[PDB]
Amino acid sequence: PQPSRPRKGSLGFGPRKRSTSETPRFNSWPSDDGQPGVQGFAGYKAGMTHVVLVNDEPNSPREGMEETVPVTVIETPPMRAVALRAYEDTPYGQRPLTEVWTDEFHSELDRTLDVPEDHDPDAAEEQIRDAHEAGDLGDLRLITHTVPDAVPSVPKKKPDVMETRVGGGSVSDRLDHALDIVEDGGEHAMNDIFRAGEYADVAGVTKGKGTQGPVKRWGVQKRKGKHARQGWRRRIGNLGPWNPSRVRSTVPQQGQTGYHQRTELNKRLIDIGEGDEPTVDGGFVNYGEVDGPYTLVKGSVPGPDKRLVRFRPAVRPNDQPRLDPEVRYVSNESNQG
Amino acid sequence: RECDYCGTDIEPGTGTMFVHKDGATTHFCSSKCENNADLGREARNLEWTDTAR
Amino acid sequence: MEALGADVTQGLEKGSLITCADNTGARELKVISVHGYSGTKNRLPKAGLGDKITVSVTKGTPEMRRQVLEAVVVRQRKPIRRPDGTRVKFEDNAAVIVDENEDPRGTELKGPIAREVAQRFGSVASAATMIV
RNA sequence: CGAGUGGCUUGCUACCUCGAUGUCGGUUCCCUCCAUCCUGCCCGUGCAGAAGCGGGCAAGGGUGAGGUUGUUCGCCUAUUAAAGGAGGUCGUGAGCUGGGUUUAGACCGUCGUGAGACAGGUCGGCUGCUAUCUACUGGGUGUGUAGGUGUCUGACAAGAACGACCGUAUAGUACGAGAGGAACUACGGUUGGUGGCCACUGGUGUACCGGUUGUUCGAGAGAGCACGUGCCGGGUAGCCACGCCACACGGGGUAAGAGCUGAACGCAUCUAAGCUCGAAACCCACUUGGAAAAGAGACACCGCCGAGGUCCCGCGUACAAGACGCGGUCGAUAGACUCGGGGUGUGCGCGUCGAGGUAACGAGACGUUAAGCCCACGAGCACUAACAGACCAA
RNA sequence: GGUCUUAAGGUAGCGUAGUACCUUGCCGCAUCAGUAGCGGCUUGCAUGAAUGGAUUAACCAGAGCUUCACUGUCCCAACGUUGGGCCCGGUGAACUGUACAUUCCAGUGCGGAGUCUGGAGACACCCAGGGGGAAGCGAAGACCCUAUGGA
RNA sequence: GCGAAAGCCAAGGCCUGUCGGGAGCAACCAACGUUAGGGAAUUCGGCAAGUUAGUCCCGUACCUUCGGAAGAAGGGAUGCC
RNA sequence: GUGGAAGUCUGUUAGAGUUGGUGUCCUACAAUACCCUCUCGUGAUCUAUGUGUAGGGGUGAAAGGCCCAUCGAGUCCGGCA
Ligand SMILES: [Cl-]
Ligand SMILES: [Cl-]
Ligand SMILES: [K+]
Ligand SMILES: [Mg+2]
Ligand SMILES: [Mg+2]
Ligand SMILES: [Mg+2]
Ligand SMILES: [Mg+2]
Ligand SMILES: [Mg+2]
Ligand SMILES: [Mg+2]
Ligand SMILES: [Mg+2]
Ligand SMILES: [Mg+2]
Ligand SMILES: [Mg+2]
Ligand SMILES: [Mg+2]
Ligand SMILES: [Mg+2]
Ligand SMILES: [Mg+2]
Ligand SMILES: [Mg+2]
Ligand SMILES: [Mg+2]
Ligand SMILES: [Mg+2]
Ligand SMILES: [Mg+2]
Ligand SMILES: [Mg+2]
Ligand SMILES: [Mg+2]
Ligand SMILES: [Mg+2]
Ligand SMILES: [Mg+2]
Ligand SMILES: [Mg+2]
Ligand SMILES: [Mg+2]
Ligand SMILES: [Mg+2]
Ligand SMILES: [Mg+2]
Ligand SMILES: [Mg+2]
Ligand SMILES: [Mg+2]
Ligand SMILES: [Mg+2]
Ligand SMILES: [Mg+2]
Ligand SMILES: [Mg+2]
Ligand SMILES: [Mg+2]
Ligand SMILES: [Mg+2]
Ligand SMILES: [Mg+2]
Ligand code: NA
Ligand code: NA
Ligand code: NA
Ligand code: NA
Ligand code: NA
Ligand code: NA
Ligand code: NA
Ligand code: NA
Ligand code: NA
Ligand code: NA
Ligand code: NA
Ligand code: NA
Ligand code: NA
Ligand code: NA
Ligand code: NA
Ligand code: NA
Ligand code: NA
Ligand code: NA
Ligand code: NA
Ligand code: NA
């Protein structure tokens, strides 16, 4: 009688096309609770390995026992805030007002930017505080970028620039906290924001797979029984009904797959170390060797090895953060074998 | 743990625990070892095997 | 039901013939259903370790042959995962007939039983020889 | 008995197509309706409890698997929260299928003088086309906004991004003579859906290594062919799923409903004015898209003889063209070499052993030898190759 | 009914049949479940003796059913090989074409509209795709009736 | 080797079953390989694919027109020196 | 034991046939083709060459089958505008 069945694939990650920036861009931000702070970082994906742990969860009957967890290694060398951007409130949303920069620029920030030569860090500041007096000062975000140079395994040097948000106690407080972070040289690190045990959201541009059929792109079925030896093996029965005399978009078709942005929710941070504690024997295949500032992530992460992935304190966490979990054994055993 | 076929130390968070018809337990560190036993070979004769070394 | 404390990958389907692990007078059992499981269009009903199934007695004593009885999966050939990541596969697939309260219809159990089975069906477990 | 609504069925009508709008059933894939089977919130009860019975709001999501039958229908099983119904040319044959209806062959029964018939039954019996327009999925080139780099904003658009169940405690408690037997709330898990990933298990892996049958290069050594590997054993990377990770709560406004204050109507009344609450549904939240939003945006910096871009060169975290991304001696972008890490599994040769044989000869065994061989990865290393240079630009 | 039509009035068999409308007949075997199959029963709508009946070993690209074995038929798909496919050089057709044509939702009309009416939406050009629509293309419908047609 | 069978190789013939170059070479298709656990749930129907296999020894049911059924089935062996 | 009968078996010997795939093709390589699958294969066998039967006539182990891509009455021209 036509047994029911949910559709094939989600209409929520559309239109399934190539992404505009190989660098992820957050749409939402964490609310302003605790003290003033930057709400995000970044680093380059290195690879996969397991870390043995002590069951943390106080509601796990197994609480306190051994437990092997999968971990995606990621290199998170210190990023640099090069400016403070301030948006104002208009009846047409939020618009940038101005930017306050520094002078100390990374030896290679010119590979991407037309690095400033003569800026006014006082008058812009001035204009900012004035907007605040008036009551039209919308949130404050810093223009940040990385040091791809800091990761040998990463071939690129040309910095991936991107804007993260600062939200603290009052607005005044984080305006200053912002100013100061910048004034110096903008240098900051993972520890400054995150802490092992905590929950974060990892956004990234998925592994790209070129054009693909609907079977692999929408999870439709290949032809079955006798049908499959007929001249159609991996294509749907129809594009639609007679009327409406047209093909909908809701119908699964051939197209671009992968290299789309996804902000994968609630990722746990196992540990944030430095050095080669994580690195594998032989070397992280198609990636290289890790040694330096990093972060261990529970589960999978968007994108292949070498891709930039951004962090943000989970905005919709389900569990309370069970800080600094005990790390009993991080496997270094080769990935080939 | 140690492999009940080859004898090489087994990497924690890796492996299969085969359970026989009688009840006996045999931990293998790899698929290579499993299939090398499914043929009829004894770890002693295989040179690359630590049991044999 | 209560957590198995292990990850299973179903090794059975509705229609699968398996071994009857007890002195009930049943030798061959045929899977028929899976308690608390509803599939999806076309997907043939999957049965794995520690699942209360519904069975048809395939082979055995002329009194037990063709009887619709409940039972519990105690062994299977597909690898099932434990907390520490190790995998665990058995020699064959099997289950012991059970009644309403979930107490074994037979007296003794033949062959081993995964330790995870104990946590869901103790009455079956407390009657076990080897618990791997 | 009386009034009606819908257009699934059936019938009537003969307007539409006979220079053809491909049948029934099924399949697949897509949007929808509500007259709601489950799930959410309610009401009544012949509502103690549990379990039901009848009604109301409600279309978010679900609504599965099999046995006989071409069947639709329907009959039967076991599961299930429940396994609701209907529309889209009785949705879908320039998609499949062709079991039935309905060609030609043949048999049976019935009828017939007969040719032959049947709204009887049965066996066999074909599925054409290189898409012009439109439509949608993805991908590029231009123009407009009127120099470039980077970062943004968000008109609007898409989502089911989540649905449901079992279990533990609450509890053998409330209630009940008893039997039996709840809930709020807190936890843990499974299932369906969804998005991503490959440490792990599994698949592949006609890269790779080994065993071996036939035959040919005299033997040996080393190789070719045996369908795109002879067969067999093992299998890296990668791609994968049978593997692994992640997928709320809460607000705001309401429906059915429960109420408040309250008059018309001194009283009473949830409604008329007003106010409090209240659905899995609606709005936000959250994910994805999105300056071509013609009101064609905002910021910062560089530049208008020069900022920046194209071709070029070495390559990919990208890839059907096009596009995207990185590097280019101020260098590790690629190759070579060497290590590292891996796959095989002990090389030729020679020494010894070797059932035997007058001898020739001798399959094989051991040692040499974790050997020989091999790598789609990593590192070291400028040795080679990233050189020369051309073009556009306010 | 305990003979009348029309000469006789179904004997052996066979039987729910490739014949049985009723029909998925009833009972059993078998299955979790069997409009199937087989056996029995059988008043056979409307079986039956050379219009041959029954029975039957052997044979069969003949028709229906069951079990063991086997497997990607399916659960539920993956990865691979070879030829295409895609980009370049060369060669180079056909189908089809009233016109206009970037449409979509409704409506309306000879009652199934890209072209009417009202709205909505739409910058142009191009590549690739699987075919929703043009009641797509192909064939002056084989189906039906009509003709003081044909064979 | 049973063989005018396979398969590999002569003698002889041919590179004219007559367009080419490039991309780890995407989707899609055509021939095909392998697929864990399950094993006809697929389907009108096991359609398609697969399974078995050559020779020798042991052994062989019902039924039968005494010819057959039968290679029934079932069981073991197979190399090289 | 000998003997070696047979519209006998196996069988891509050669040759003959055409079961399923409803595959490939379906402006083809082809106005009936390719591939795998399958049937016979000492006889009512297959085949070449020659030769006989002619249109309401042949020929037909009968399908209204065949008689030069033409058959429930061939083809050509004529009757015919
Ligand atoms: Cl199909
Ligand atoms: Cl079931
Ligand atoms: K018509
Ligand atoms: Mg690996
Ligand atoms: Mg390993
Ligand atoms: Mg189905
Ligand atoms: Mg008419
Ligand atoms: Mg049409
Ligand atoms: Mg209603
Ligand atoms: Mg009650
Ligand atoms: Mg809906
Ligand atoms: Mg239809
Ligand atoms: Mg429909
Ligand atoms: Mg169509
Ligand atoms: Mg058609
Ligand atoms: Mg038919
Ligand atoms: Mg038929
Ligand atoms: Mg038929
Ligand atoms: Mg076609
Ligand atoms: Mg070869
Ligand atoms: Mg019968
Ligand atoms: Mg007679
Ligand atoms: Mg108009
Ligand atoms: Mg006509
Ligand atoms: Mg007629
Ligand atoms: Mg006539
Ligand atoms: Mg399999
Ligand atoms: Mg079936
Ligand atoms: Mg077949
Ligand atoms: Mg013969
Ligand atoms: Mg077909
Ligand atoms: Mg002749
Ligand atoms: Mg006839
Ligand atoms: Mg002629
Ligand atoms: Mg002819
Ligand atoms: Na085909
Ligand atoms: Na085809
Ligand atoms: Na009607
Ligand atoms: Na017409
Ligand atoms: Na149909
Ligand atoms: Na609903
Ligand atoms: Na049915
Ligand atoms: Na129609
Ligand atoms: Na068709
Ligand atoms: Na059809
Ligand atoms: Na609410
Ligand atoms: Na613009
Ligand atoms: Na008669
Ligand atoms: Na296959
Ligand atoms: Na179309
Ligand atoms: Na040539
Ligand atoms: Na004799
Ligand atoms: Na053939
Ligand atoms: Na004539
Ligand atoms: Na004439």
PDB file of N, CA and C (backbone and C1' of nucleotides) in Angstrom, chain D residues 43 59 78 103 117 194 225 245 248 301 334 354 376:
ATOM      1  P     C D  43      -8.844  18.596  31.868  1.00  0.00           P
ATOM      2  O5'   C D  43     -10.256  18.138  31.288  1.00  0.00           O
ATOM      3  C5'   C D  43     -11.236  19.116  30.896  1.00  0.00           C
ATOM      4  C4'   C D  43     -12.428  18.450  30.251  1.00  0.00           C
ATOM      5  C3'   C D  43     -13.082  17.312  31.011  1.00  0.00           C
ATOM      6  O3'   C D  43     -13.939  17.790  32.046  1.00  0.00           O
ATOM      7  C1'   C D  43     -12.822  16.692  28.757  1.00  0.00           C
ATOM      8  P     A D  59      -2.724  20.772  12.688  1.00  0.00           P
ATOM      9  O5'   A D  59      -1.846  19.467  12.470  1.00  0.00           O
ATOM     10  C5'   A D  59      -0.453  19.444  12.804  1.00  0.00           C
ATOM     11  C4'   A D  59       0.307  18.627  11.781  1.00  0.00           C
ATOM     12  C3'   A D  59       0.287  19.187  10.367  1.00  0.00           C
ATOM     13  O3'   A D  59       1.525  18.884   9.723  1.00  0.00           O
ATOM     14  C1'   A D  59      -0.797  17.086  10.388  1.00  0.00           C
ATOM     15  P     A D  78       0.824 -15.011  16.509  1.00  0.00           P
ATOM     16  O5'   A D  78       2.275 -14.373  16.619  1.00  0.00           O
ATOM     17  C5'   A D  78       3.434 -15.211  16.639  1.00  0.00           C
ATOM     18  C4'   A D  78       4.651 -14.401  16.316  1.00  0.00           C
ATOM     19  C3'   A D  78       4.745 -13.099  17.072  1.00  0.00           C
ATOM     20  O3'   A D  78       5.180 -13.308  18.385  1.00  0.00           O
ATOM     21  C1'   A D  78       5.292 -12.710  14.841  1.00  0.00           C
ATOM     22  C1'   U D 103      -2.783 -10.365 -30.668  1.00  0.00           C
ATOM     23  C3'   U D 103      -4.186 -12.140 -30.039  1.00  0.00           C
ATOM     24  C4'   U D 103      -4.724 -10.862 -29.442  1.00  0.00           C
ATOM     25  O3'   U D 103      -5.265 -12.980 -30.378  1.00  0.00           O
ATOM     26  C5'   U D 103      -5.150 -10.948 -27.992  1.00  0.00           C
ATOM     27  O5'   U D 103      -4.134 -11.602 -27.197  1.00  0.00           O
ATOM     28  P     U D 103      -4.375 -11.905 -25.650  1.00  0.00           P
ATOM     29  P     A D 117     -13.445 -17.520 -32.251  1.00  0.00           P
ATOM     30  O5'   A D 117     -14.762 -17.369 -31.364  1.00  0.00           O
ATOM     31  C5'   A D 117     -15.765 -16.381 -31.676  1.00  0.00           C
ATOM     32  C4'   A D 117     -16.927 -16.489 -30.711  1.00  0.00           C
ATOM     33  C3'   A D 117     -16.557 -16.342 -29.248  1.00  0.00           C
ATOM     34  O3'   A D 117     -16.590 -14.975 -28.863  1.00  0.00           O
ATOM     35  C1'   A D 117     -17.867 -18.291 -29.534  1.00  0.00           C
ATOM     36  P     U D 194      18.394   9.789   7.000  1.00  0.00           P
ATOM     37  O5'   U D 194      19.097  11.056   7.652  1.00  0.00           O
ATOM     38  C5'   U D 194      18.382  12.279   7.767  1.00  0.00           C
ATOM     39  C4'   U D 194      19.176  13.276   8.551  1.00  0.00           C
ATOM     40  C3'   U D 194      20.647  13.372   8.216  1.00  0.00           C
ATOM     41  O3'   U D 194      20.824  14.161   7.068  1.00  0.00           O
ATOM     42  C1'   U D 194      20.361  13.405  10.560  1.00  0.00           C
ATOM     43  P     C D 225      52.096 -11.545 -18.859  1.00  0.00           P
ATOM     44  O5'   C D 225      51.250 -12.699 -19.540  1.00  0.00           O
ATOM     45  C5'   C D 225      50.954 -12.643 -20.942  1.00  0.00           C
ATOM     46  C4'   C D 225      50.377 -13.957 -21.412  1.00  0.00           C
ATOM     47  C3'   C D 225      49.208 -14.526 -20.611  1.00  0.00           C
ATOM     48  O3'   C D 225      47.942 -13.927 -20.928  1.00  0.00           O
ATOM     49  C1'   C D 225      50.796 -16.229 -21.010  1.00  0.00           C
ATOM     50  P     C D 245      31.213   6.153  19.725  1.00  0.00           P
ATOM     51  O5'   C D 245      31.425   7.660  19.245  1.00  0.00           O
ATOM     52  C5'   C D 245      32.518   8.441  19.752  1.00  0.00           C
ATOM     53  C4'   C D 245      32.466   9.853  19.210  1.00  0.00           C
ATOM     54  C3'   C D 245      31.181  10.618  19.448  1.00  0.00           C
ATOM     55  O3'   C D 245      31.160  11.192  20.730  1.00  0.00           O
ATOM     56  C1'   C D 245      31.816  10.892  17.207  1.00  0.00           C
ATOM     57  P     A D 248      20.233  16.819  21.193  1.00  0.00           P
ATOM     58  O5'   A D 248      19.063  17.813  20.773  1.00  0.00           O
ATOM     59  C5'   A D 248      17.841  17.931  21.523  1.00  0.00           C
ATOM     60  C4'   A D 248      18.129  18.474  22.897  1.00  0.00           C
ATOM     61  C3'   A D 248      16.990  19.184  23.600  1.00  0.00           C
ATOM     62  O3'   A D 248      16.074  18.257  24.167  1.00  0.00           O
ATOM     63  C1'   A D 248      18.993  20.411  23.880  1.00  0.00           C
ATOM     64  P     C D 301      41.789  52.834   8.338  1.00  0.00           P
ATOM     65  O5'   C D 301      43.052  52.298   7.528  1.00  0.00           O
ATOM     66  C5'   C D 301      44.036  51.471   8.178  1.00  0.00           C
ATOM     67  C4'   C D 301      44.573  50.437   7.219  1.00  0.00           C
ATOM     68  C3'   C D 301      45.085  50.965   5.896  1.00  0.00           C
ATOM     69  O3'   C D 301      46.390  51.495   6.034  1.00  0.00           O
ATOM     70  C1'   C D 301      43.756  49.077   5.498  1.00  0.00           C
ATOM     71  P     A D 334      55.209  18.504  -1.259  1.00  0.00           P
ATOM     72  O5'   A D 334      55.816  17.861  -2.581  1.00  0.00           O
ATOM     73  C5'   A D 334      54.931  17.412  -3.603  1.00  0.00           C
ATOM     74  C4'   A D 334      55.665  17.207  -4.891  1.00  0.00           C
ATOM     75  C3'   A D 334      56.735  16.146  -4.879  1.00  0.00           C
ATOM     76  O3'   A D 334      56.228  14.836  -4.924  1.00  0.00           O
ATOM     77  C1'   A D 334      57.566  18.028  -5.991  1.00  0.00           C
ATOM     78  P     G D 354      72.102 -38.098   6.631  1.00  0.00           P
ATOM     79  O5'   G D 354      70.849 -38.006   5.658  1.00  0.00           O
ATOM     80  C5'   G D 354      69.503 -37.949   6.172  1.00  0.00           C
ATOM     81  C4'   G D 354      68.540 -37.709   5.037  1.00  0.00           C
ATOM     82  C3'   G D 354      68.751 -38.651   3.865  1.00  0.00           C
ATOM     83  O3'   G D 354      68.058 -39.869   4.076  1.00  0.00           O
ATOM     84  C1'   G D 354      68.546 -36.438   3.065  1.00  0.00           C
ATOM     85  P     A D 376      55.565   4.391  -3.433  1.00  0.00           P
ATOM     86  O5'   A D 376      54.249   5.263  -3.434  1.00  0.00           O
ATOM     87  C5'   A D 376      53.485   5.320  -2.245  1.00  0.00           C
ATOM     88  C4'   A D 376      52.255   6.147  -2.438  1.00  0.00           C
ATOM     89  C3'   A D 376      51.469   6.294  -1.138  1.00  0.00           C
ATOM     90  O3'   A D 376      50.928   7.608  -1.139  1.00  0.00           O
ATOM     91  C1'   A D 376      50.056   5.476  -2.774  1.00  0.00           C
TER      92        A D 376
END
